Design a binder for this molecule. Structure first.
Ligand SMILES: O=C1NC(=O)/C(=C/c2ccc3ncccc3c2)S1
Ligand code: NA
Length: 327
């Protein structure tokens, strides 16, 4: 069968912890007072939640309330525990409270409010400097959660809240996040289509933090090339074909060979044969001011089939692309 894989950083962080850190099922929630929060406006609906702007009437500060659906099948406890474990980390959304919603009767998570324009609305208008600046801020969040034994598994523009006026960023929606345990096989039905790593698309379950670095690379490519999304698959199958048209098929087949993966036979009729395109093929008059040799080398080192070969978040922060950003 498939050959096993282990993360090359933060491999055993959870194994050394007391079980309370990662055994989210045994976590006992401390409840706040639902009357502290008055709902202001409906912001939108998640797959398992509904999200509202609200006011904390005890300090009159804006907050956001995420009321979870009872269809969660025990997944509420995981998100709560992960949010509490990561609270205070750089650029991690702050869980301010947990209350029991009086109408739905499910847990409602209370977050700090971010005066964002949501990143997907903004990330196609940024200057070269601002792409580098905000990418570095996202990397602070990812290295923090990875170093804490957690993979986000849903990195995408919608899940990065950016207050562009104040140049502040928060990584949100930890509802798909999971604790990394070496040797564990995970569900591949995570992340959003355009940001899914090759490991998910080829059904390789023993993945790790490096999944988030693929998703980050997809965001970077969309920003520097002004192409939304960069890999524009019509479904999960065509998604891998779109990747192969850029990265080539012989490296894909080498990845499959290395991990002893049984490629879904459906790919035989759609993958074709493709050679890697040099990154300069995607440069044009409208995006060339966002492209530099450093940007292309950095992207090249994120968007690799082999999850063990991609830059880690800390390696990424060391890259020359960020030498221009004030630290
Ligand atoms: O589905 C979700 N999961 C989260 O973790 C969310 C967090 C969040 C935080 C702050 C916000 N500020 C303004 C507007 C929306 C906001 C949303 S929404
Ligand atoms: Na820097």
């Amino acid at each position: 069968g498939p050959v096993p894989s282990r993360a090359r950083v933060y491999t055993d962080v959870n194994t050394h912890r007391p079980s309370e850190y990662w055994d989210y099922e045994s976590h006992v929630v401390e409840w706040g007072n639902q009357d502290d929060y008055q709902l202001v406006r409906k912001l939108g609906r998640g797959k398992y939640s509904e999200v509202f702007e609200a006011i904390n009437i005890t300090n009159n500060e804006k907050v956001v309330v995420k009321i979870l659906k009872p269809v969660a099948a025990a997944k509420i406890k995981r998100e709560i525990k992960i949010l509490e474990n990561l609270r205070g980390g750089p650029n991690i959304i702050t869980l301010a409270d947990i209350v029991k919603d009086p109408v739905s009767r499910t847990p409602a998570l209370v977050f700090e409010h971010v005066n964002n324009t949501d990143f997907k609305q903004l990330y196609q208008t940024l200057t070269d400097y601002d792409i580098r600046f905000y990418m570095y801020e996202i990397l602070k969040a990812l290295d923090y959660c990875h170093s804490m034994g957690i993979m986000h598994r849903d990195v995408k523009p919608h899940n990065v809240m950016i207050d562009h006026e104040h140049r502040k960023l928060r990584l949100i929606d930890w509802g798909l996040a999971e604790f990394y345990h070496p040797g564990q096989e995970y569900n591949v039905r995570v992340a959003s289509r355009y940001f899914k790593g090759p490991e998910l698309l080829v059904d390789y379950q023993m993945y790790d933090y490096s999944l988030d670095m693929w998703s980050l690379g997809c965001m970077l490519a969309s920003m520097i090339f002004r192409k939304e999304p960069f890999f524009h698959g019509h479904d999960n199958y065509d998604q891998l074909v779109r990747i192969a048209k850029v990265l080539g098929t012989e490296d894909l087949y080498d990845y499959i060979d290395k991990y002893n993966i049984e490629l879904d036979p459906r790919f035989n009729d759609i993958l074709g044969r493709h050679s890697r395109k040099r990154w300069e093929r995607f440069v044009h008059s409208e995006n060339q001011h966002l492209v530099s040799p450093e940007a292309l080398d950095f992207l090249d080192k994120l968007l690799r089939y082999d999850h063990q070969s991609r830059l880690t978040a800390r390696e990424a922060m060391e890259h020359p692309y960020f030498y221009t950003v004030v630290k």
